[PDB]
């Protein structure tokens, strides 16, 4: 829960999310762009025409919203189990050989 | 008593919560069996 830490009056516009995109995302893919998304038969992504909508939208995190709209801080940890010299482990104490 | 009318009303009010708020449901049921298909997607044909 981070409702009382990531909200601004009148809706918070400091946290944005991409509402429109032309293609599907691959795993662990990061993309930053502002080209106008194309939805109709009129060219977009470089020219502003018909059915060309801005690909970005704002959450508008208000100071008091429902639990489904309050800002929550999310961290995802991805673990790599590939064969390599292990560099991170638990506090499991070592023992004599 | 102990005998009720099987049908009851909803009374959908605009002020009610989203849980009890009306939802318009359409089910598109297809069957994929042996028959000459009459409805197809918008895919252009190609020369034989």
């Amino acid at each position: 829960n981070s409702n009382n830490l990531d909200s601004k009056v009148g809706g918070n516009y400091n946290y944005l999310y991409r509402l429109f995109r032309k293609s599907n995302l691959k795993p662990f893919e990061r993309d930053i762009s502002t080209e106008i998304y194309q939805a109709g038969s009129t060219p977009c992504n470089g020219v502003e025409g018909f059915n060309c909508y801005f690909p970005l939208q704002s959450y508008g995190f208000q100071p008091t919203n429902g639990v489904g709209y309050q800002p929550y801080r999310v961290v995802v940890l991805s673990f790599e189990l590939l064969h390599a010299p292990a560099t991170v482990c638990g506090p499991k104490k070592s023992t004599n050989l | 008593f102990n005998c009720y009318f099987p049908l009851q009303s909803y009374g959908f009010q605009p002020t009610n919560g989203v849980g009890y708020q009306p939802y318009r449901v359409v089910v598109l049921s297809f069957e994929l069996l042996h028959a000459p298909a009459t409805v197809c997607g918008p895919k252009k044909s190609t020369n034989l």
Epitope: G11, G66 | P14, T15, G17
Partner: antibody, heavy 126, light 105 residues
Framework: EVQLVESGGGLVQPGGSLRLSCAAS????????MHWVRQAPGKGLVWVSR????????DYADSVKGRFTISKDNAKNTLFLQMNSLRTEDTAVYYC???????????????????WGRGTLVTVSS | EIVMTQSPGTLSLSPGERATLSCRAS???????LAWYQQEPGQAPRLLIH???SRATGIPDRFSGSGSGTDFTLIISRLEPEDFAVYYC?????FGQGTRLEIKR
């Protein structure tokens, strides 16, 4: 331009009947949702009726119910509002007010009004 | 059903000083689907903000406010000689009592 012209109205004795018309020019009248909003002389406003093009629901407020009838003739592009047994307290002006529609895959009206035609006064007295 | 109250009842300020208005629903939450209208005494009302957050096209950038839950507030960035009007707020079924923005002398 897009405008709504109100027709009818005038002095009527108590218990009488009247019909108001709203001709719509400059836009597609049938698709948009339509509404009636009243305005008492020197008072606030209260919405009178909601009509879908089908008009099956939200049409009448209790006090409005039983006395006004709302009709939306799309064929010849106009709106009707007819009353019976009009009472003294309904002396006011009437506005034909539109309801915004997105006109996407689902029309989904938004219950906020876009334009307000010039008012027609109705007065009932002895 | 829903009853809407306006705070304050009257709001008098200088011709340049900005103002804010608070509107309150009687109970429950309506998914923040709220509208604000300003009505000049001689003219018909005019919609200023819809869905309680987004302002309609053609409306000046000055009018900007948002709210959520049972209370929605609308803020006005500056002031010019057009505030001689009564501001009504509209939910699904009812309108608020309104607030007249008076000029101060």
């Amino acid at each position: 331009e897009v405008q709504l012209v109100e027709s009818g109205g005038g002095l009527v004795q108590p218990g009488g009947s009247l019909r108001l018309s709203c001709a719509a020019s400059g836009f597609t009248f049938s698709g948009y949702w339509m509404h009636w909003v009243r305005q008492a002389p020197g008072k606030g406003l209260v919405w009178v009726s909601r009509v879908n093009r089908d008009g099956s629901d939200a049409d009448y407020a209790d006090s409005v119910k039983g006395r006004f009838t709302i009709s939306k003739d799309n064929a010849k592009n106009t709106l009707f509002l007819q009353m019976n047994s009009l009472r003294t307290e309904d002396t006011a002006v009437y506005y034909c007010v539109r309801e915004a529609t997105t006109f996407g895959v689902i029309i989904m009206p938004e219950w906020y009004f876009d334009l307000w035609g010039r008012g027609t006064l109705v007065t009932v007295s002895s | 059903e829903i009853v809407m109250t306006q705070s304050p009842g009257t709001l008098s300020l200088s011709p340049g000083e900005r103002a804010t208005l608070s509107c309150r629903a009687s109970q429950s939450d309506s998914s923040n689907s709220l509208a604000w209208y300003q009505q000049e005494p001689g003219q018909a009302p005019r919609l200023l903000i819809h869905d309680a957050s987004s302002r309609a096209t053609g409306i000046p950038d000055r009018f900007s406010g948002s709210g959520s839950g049972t209370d929605f507030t609308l803020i006005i960035s500056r002031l010019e000689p057009e505030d001689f009007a009564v501001y009504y707020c509209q939910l699904y079924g009812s309108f608020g009592q309104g607030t007249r923005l008076e000029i101060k002398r």
